[PDB]
Design a protein around this ligand. Sequence first.
Ligand SMILES: COc1ccc(S(=O)(=O)N(C[C@H]2CCC(=O)N2)C[C@@H](O)[C@H](Cc2ccccc2)NC(=O)O[C@@H]2C[C@@H]3CCO[C@@H]3C2)cc1
Ligand SMILES: [Cl-]
Ligand SMILES: [Cl-]
Ligand code: NA
Lengths: 99, 99
Amino acid sequence: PQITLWKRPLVTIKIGGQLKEALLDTGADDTVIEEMSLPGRWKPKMIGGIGGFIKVRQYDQIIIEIAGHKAIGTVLVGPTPVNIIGRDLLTQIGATLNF
Amino acid sequence: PQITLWKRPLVTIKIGGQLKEALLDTGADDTVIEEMSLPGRWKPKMIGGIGGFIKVRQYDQIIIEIAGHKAIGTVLVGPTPVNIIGRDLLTQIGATLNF
Ligand SMILES: COc1ccc(S(=O)(=O)N(C[C@H]2CCC(=O)N2)C[C@@H](O)[C@H](Cc2ccccc2)NC(=O)O[C@@H]2C[C@@H]3CCO[C@@H]3C2)cc1
Ligand SMILES: [Cl-]
Ligand SMILES: [Cl-]
Ligand code: NA
């Protein structure tokens, strides 16, 4: 698809067996999801942006289905105000910005 | 152009006759620039990012070039870690997300 940007580019994702709504975000290095359980090992991380930093749990090699496309990558889990699909997974589905 | 996302989608902008670097950010509703001087009056705005809410100065109808494309519109000035071009101005330069 071609997604215009008149509105927030929200898509449905499946992660950890759960459906969630998430923002396709070229300005995010990594994927950041609201509190949820994920399997396997993790390590703490601090990520920052407008308003400062939050503490997240970094899970690697997590499978996500993004608007019908499967991808594997890093997911950060923490108190994010919106679920964000970042560049680490956008690349895997071949997403580009065009103008 | 067609911009892949393996690295940050940074472009050159021109505002106030000055060249600056900015991030093309589909996850940003608004355009937010680091502290600079702009003409005219400003109005207050609060925006909420990953770490919480901040106060910014809103300047309207500002001429800005983005990657060689002219836009005219609202610019928020405040303590952002990086200059971000949000959907307000991405729509003006005809940007879309594609996969
Ligand atoms: C390491 O991975 C990440 C680190 C930080 C972020 S972020 O959410 O802080 N952010 C990074 C951007 C902003 C600074 C920078 O260098 N890159 C992703 C953004 O797209 C973010 C994504 C976002 C975070 C929180 C709420 C809504 C969207 N949007 C955002 O801050 O937009 C600002 C806030 C206002 C709300 C929406 O638009 C308005 C303008 C995401 C993943
Ligand atoms: Cl960060
Ligand atoms: Cl590619
Ligand atoms: Na893992």
